[PDB]
Amino acid sequence: MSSKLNETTEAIQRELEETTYQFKVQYNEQPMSAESYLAASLDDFKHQFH
Amino acid sequence: LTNKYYCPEVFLDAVATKLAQTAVLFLNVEMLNDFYVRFPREVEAKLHEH
Amino acid sequence: KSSFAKHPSARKVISDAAATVLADRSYATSDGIEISLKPYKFDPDIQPNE
Amino acid sequence: KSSFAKHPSARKVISDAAATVLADRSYATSDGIEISLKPYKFDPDIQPNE
């Protein structure tokens, strides 16, 4: 385990690096949660009904 | 405008205007839009927590 | 002008929520404005209309 | 077209110089560009002559 550890780390870091650059260029690292989205759409529906 | 070193006033005010407008663009997007989306959510959260 | 003219506490909760969103964003806005201004610090070329 | 057409050692010295300078400055140029573009990613407003 200890010997394969170094190389598995290198590999995992790679697959994390690609993940990070895309999160920056395409979503501008905007935080997103279900509760946020839901509350926001709900305030939309409410203004519409009002 | 060819005699810029003759008329520093007008030149300096153009530089001010331009800087101002492009900093306004970046300001409008980053600060202002982030306020538009994050402000209801933060009201909600902090009003509920209070 | 709002329905929270009275209730000064809840209002201050709203006002501080505003103060906290703007505080978080303030630097990141400022640094992006300075990088966006890096070409006009070197040569702020001034057009005849400007 | 310079006097270093021959002497490919001295030529490759220069070449490896340009590349090393460019390689060094490459990152800051790319990220600054993305950051200066973040306002136009949102609303790339189009002018009539554009």
Can you read off the two tokens belonging to residue B30?
Answer: 């980053």
Touch between chain C and chain A (3+ CB pairs, < 8 Å)? no
Structural method: cryo-EM
Size of interface B-C (CB pairs under 8 A): 64
Give DSSP secondary structure letters for chain D. --TTSS-HHHHHHHHHHHHHHHHHHHHHHHHHHHHHHHHHHH--PPPS--
Identity of the residue in C26, C33, C48 whose CB atom sits nearest the CB atom of B1: C48
Q: How far is B27 from chain D (nearest CA, A)?
A: 9
Q: Do A25 and D38 touch (CB under 8 A)?
A: no
One-letter amino acid at D39 equals: P
Q: Cβ contacts (< 8 Å) between D41 and chain A: which residues?
A: 28
Long-range interactions of A36-41: CB distance < 8 A, separation 24+: A36/B41, A39/B40, A39/B41, A39/B44, A40/B37, A40/B40, A40/B41
Q: Of A28, D35, D38, whose CA–CA distance to C31 is shortest?
A: D35
Resolution of this entry, Å: 14.7
